[PDB]
RNA sequence: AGCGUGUGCCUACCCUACGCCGGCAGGCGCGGGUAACCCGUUGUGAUGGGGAUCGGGGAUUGCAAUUAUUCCCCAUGAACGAGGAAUUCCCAGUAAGUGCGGGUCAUAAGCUUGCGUUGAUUAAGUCCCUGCCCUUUGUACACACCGCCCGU
RNA sequence: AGGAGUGGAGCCUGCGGCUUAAUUUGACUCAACACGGGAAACCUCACCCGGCCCGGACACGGACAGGAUUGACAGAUUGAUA
């Protein structure tokens, strides 16, 4: 009988905290400064989601999680 | 309904077992009578334990 | 819906044993002695023996009503 | 997310699906005739269930 | 004649889907253990067979000491 | 823990309409014997019951893998003080006297 | 020299055909594991094998892949493709041949290390 | 011939009878059973004789079994005819040979708990070994002989 | 001076000797040694090459619309569609 000896790797880890900005500069912008503004995201034509569902952007496969929709040309 | 179980709660001692028995007796009686007679003879303040299942078939 | 007669009798014994233990840990201070169930057509009358009864009923049967409510909502009998 | 993990491969011999109905003990279960106790608990209550030592 | 062909020694063997005939003594014993291909593939079963020990895994530490006597 | 607050007010409605209850430890399951079909997830509801009866002011009694509770009038006063629902709404349990 | 055949028949033509008569001229040992069926988490080993196959210049040893998949391969089309598996505390790689039906990946690991002999004394020597 | 087991408070896991047919459990349908109702009237001795590793036939469907689940046929030949010191159990339906059913559980046993079938050579004794008890006796032991205790 | 079956010839497991991730709790002879009804992947493994969501009716401290909760294959992870 001995110990478990979970000691060789990772003696201490620091928590992963997201530097989420309180100001919507990276998230949304108007670039117009007017009452009527344009939106920098593609209109979703799917009717399995809501009418206010806006997707973000990555290098590909805009990862919504709920639907896993990826734009492909068939 | 035999059930054999080790006597010692731990695993120490001579291997000793309790042999428990549960003996269930069952009897059937056949007759010809309408339902009212059967349900009038059933409610006779039966002594405990004698479960009754009355069937029509 | 229907279970085998050996299982039925074992379950009835389990009913009796757990009811006895439950009202032993409930009202041992009431001088409880034993509990007996009575076979009745499509009903299960239960008669409980205690040295003192004025305490087990109490005032207007608060203890009795509490016990019947908990036993009903525990055992799954019809209302 | 939750449904992405649960119910992936059926556990048809799940030991943890049973426990002693009196003290919640994992070992020595008595599932015969539906007692579903650790054998110690059964010995404690065997006379009350109806099981008796006759032989 | 379509007779049930489960009366021959080595069936469904590699290198021939048909049951070819052979003869002579000192030659059946070798072919009862076609260990060449499994030795080649660097498998543990080849050296299980080779040492004369247990391929399926017969327990040998208190029982099963025969095989060399 | 890891308990939401809408589930908290739902379980408080359940305690107000219920009061006296018997419970069985069931967490990992998706289907309970006698406390399912509440349109609310079972795990958080049972942990809500755990909070109620282990906050340190209402005593418990556990045996035969079951929970029987003695809801003290201190709990009645606590619920009245927090949720501010007058006790003039008598519980429906006081029929069939 | 000519390429060594598998049970006297080729593989590519039988791969282009369905499974209706695939087992009529096969050996046991994966006799029914081929027929057991399919579940999730099976195209993983095939996918990484195809990745190592495509990204490797021809007539060269590929990169070492890390996996523990003790699985079955329904298609022997991967002649020339090899699987490396974590064994013990390191990797291990095993020669592949056209003969895949008749064996399993898990049948190549040696774990029964020879008894490290001791010199017991003090106690019961007699 | 079993003694016995067998399907919802849990719970999603119960025991099982004909056809695709290579030679049968059986990959899919198919009904019965809360059970006395269904499973189920469950030529003189290594030769032919009891198997040393180990290979094919359709595999029961258990991710993995090999880091324990899964059939018999080709007769390829193993000290092939009462066993170091030390030895455990047993006196009649004993022992032993067998299989079968439960507990474990996925019909998971090589374990255990029971059950039958075949079935009996030896002893109806003694205190020799180990140990026990209805006596007397001795003691410096009483932590009780695995004691106490003497000697540079 | 009896005997039969004996542990040796046909179906593996208990725990100590016993390299590291292998010899993993309690049981020091009859009264431990398929015994904990304990048939070891895994939920039961504490010898285990590895991690995580964490536990406070209170005594003291950090101070609110963000101080992160199992929750993406393809550059990878130390088997793992974590």
Swiss-Prot record, chain A:
Residues 1-18 are annotated as: Disordered. This is Small ribosomal subunit protein eS31. A zinc finger (C4-type) spans 44-67. It is found in: Cytoplasm; Nucleus, Nucleolus. Changing residue 30 to R: Abolished monoubiquitination by RNF25, leading to impaired ability to rescue stalled ribosomes. There is a cross-link at residues 30, 36 (Glycyl lysine isopeptide (Lys-Gly) (interchain with G-Cter in ubiquitin)). Changing residue 36 to R: Abolished monoubiquitination by RNF25, leading to impaired ability to rescue stalled ribosomes. Abolished deubiquitination by USP16, without affecting maturation of the 40S ribosomal complex. The modification N6-acetyllysine is found at residues 27, 36. Monoubiquitinated at Lys-30 and Lys-36 by RNF25 in response to ribosome collisions (ribosome stalling): ubiquitination promotes subsequent activation of RNF14, leading to EEF1A1 ubiquitination and degradation and rescue of stalled ribosomes. Deubiquitination at Lys-36 by USP16 is required for maturation of the 40S ribosomal complex. The gene is RPS27A. It comes from Homo sapiens.
UniProtKB/Swiss-Prot annotation, chain B:
The keyword Ribosomal protein applies. Coiled coil: none annotated. The modification N6-acetyllysine is found at residue 15. GO terms for cellular component: cytoplasm; cytosol; cytosolic ribosome; cytosolic small ribosomal subunit; extracellular exosome; membrane; nucleoplasm; synapse. Keywords: Acetylation, Cytoplasm, Isopeptide bond, Phosphoprotein, Ribonucleoprotein, Ribosomal protein, Ubl conjugation. It comes from the Eukaryota. One of its GO terms (molecular function) is MDM2/MDM4 family protein binding. The keyword Ribonucleoprotein applies. Its main location: cytoplasm. It is found in: Cytoplasm. The modification Phosphoserine is found at residue 33. Polyubiquitinated by ZNF598 via 'Lys-63'-linked ubiquitin chains when a ribosome has stalled, initiating the ribosome quality control (RQC) pathway to degrade the potentially detrimental aberrant nascent polypeptide. Deubiquitinated by OTUD3 and USP21, antagonizing ZNF598 activity. Ufmylated by UFL1. One of its GO terms (biological process) is positive regulation of signal transduction by p53 class mediator. Belongs to the universal ribosomal protein uS10 family. Component of the 40S small ribosomal subunit. Component of the small ribosomal subunit. The ribosome is a large ribonucleoprotein complex responsible for the synthesis of proteins in the cell. This is Small ribosomal subunit protein uS10. It comes from Homo sapiens (Human). The chain holds residues 61 to 117 of 119 of the full protein.
UniProtKB/Swiss-Prot annotation, chain F:
GO terms for biological process: cytoplasmic translation; translation. Methylated by PRMT5. Methylation is necessary for its interaction with NPS1, its localization in the granular component (GC) region of the nucleolus, for the proper assembly of ribosomes, protein synthesis and optimal cell proliferation. It is found in: Cytoplasm; Nucleus, Nucleolus. Keywords: Cytoplasm, Diamond-Blackfan anemia, Isopeptide bond, Methylation, Nucleus, Phosphoprotein, Ribonucleoprotein, Ribosomal protein, Ubl conjugation. Its main location: cytoplasm. The keyword Cell inner membrane does not apply. It comes from the Eukaryota. GO terms for cellular component: cytoplasm; cytosol; cytosolic ribosome; cytosolic small ribosomal subunit; focal adhesion; membrane; nucleolus; nucleoplasm. One of its GO terms (molecular function) is RNA binding. The modification Phosphotyrosine is found at residue 12. It is linked to Diamond-Blackfan anemia 9: A form of Diamond-Blackfan anemia, a congenital non-regenerative hypoplastic anemia that usually presents early in infancy. Diamond-Blackfan anemia is characterized by a moderate to severe macrocytic anemia, erythroblastopenia, and an increased risk of malignancy. 30 to 40% of Diamond-Blackfan anemia patients present with short stature and congenital anomalies, the most frequent being craniofacial (Pierre-Robin syndrome and cleft palate), thumb and urogenital anomalies. Component of the small ribosomal subunit. The methylated form interacts with NPM1. Belongs to the eukaryotic ribosomal protein eS10 family.
From Swiss-Prot, chain G:
Pfam families: Ribosomal_S19. One of its GO terms (biological process) is positive regulation of signal transduction by p53 class mediator. InterPro entries: Ribosomal_uS19, Ribosomal_uS19_CS, Ribosomal_uS19_euk/arc, Ribosomal_uS19_SF. It is found in: Cytoplasm. Keywords: Acetylation, Cytoplasm, Isopeptide bond, Ribonucleoprotein, Ribosomal protein, Ubl conjugation. GO terms for molecular function: DNA binding; MDM2/MDM4 family protein binding; RNA binding; structural constituent of ribosome; ubiquitin ligase inhibitor activity. Gene3D superfamilies: 30s Ribosomal Protein S19, Chain A (3.30.860.10). One of its GO terms (cellular component) is membrane. There is a cross-link at residue 97 (Glycyl lysine isopeptide (Lys-Gly) (interchain with G-Cter in SUMO2)). It comes from the Eukaryota. Component of the small ribosomal subunit. The ribosome is a large ribonucleoprotein complex responsible for the synthesis of proteins in the cell. Component of the small ribosomal subunit. Belongs to the universal ribosomal protein uS19 family. NCBIfam families: PRK04038.1 (NF003121), uS19_arch (TIGR01025). HAMAP family: Ribosomal_uS19. This is Small ribosomal subunit protein uS19. It comes from Homo sapiens.
